[PDB]
Amino acid sequence: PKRVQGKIVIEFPSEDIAEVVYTSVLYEHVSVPYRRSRVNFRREGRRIVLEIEANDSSAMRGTVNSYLRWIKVALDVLNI
């Protein structure tokens, strides 16, 4: 499946939500000892920029799943 490049951009309603979600997803990314395949991501204002570079489809599905679901949890709690 050669290389699996993937770019995800998520624009959040506030500049604060983007920080809170970044800060919570960061702490995971900074850990995540098992390294499925490279995922450098940064916060650009209200937006979050994710840039996965994976080895197979399982690695892609896994990375994308984790990172967006972490965003989901962060957003869920953030609006409770």
Partner 1 sequence: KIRAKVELTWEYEDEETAKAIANAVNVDNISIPEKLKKSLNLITFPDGARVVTKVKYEGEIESLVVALDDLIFAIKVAEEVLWS
Q: Which residues bind partner 1 (CB under 8 A)?
A: 1-13, 57-58, 60-61, 64-65, 68-69, 71-72, 75
Q: Which is nearer to partner 1, 4 or 39 (CB)?
A: 4
Q: Which is nearer to partner 1, 3 or 38 (CB)?
A: 3
Tokens of 63: 């990375």
Residue 42 Cβ vs partner 1, minimum distance, rounded to whole Å? 15
CA angle 14, 6, 17 (to 5 degrees): 10
CA within 13 Å, CB half, 49: 5
Q: Which is nearer to partner 1, 26 or 56 (CB)?
A: 56
Separation of alpha carbons 75 and 7, rounded Å: 20
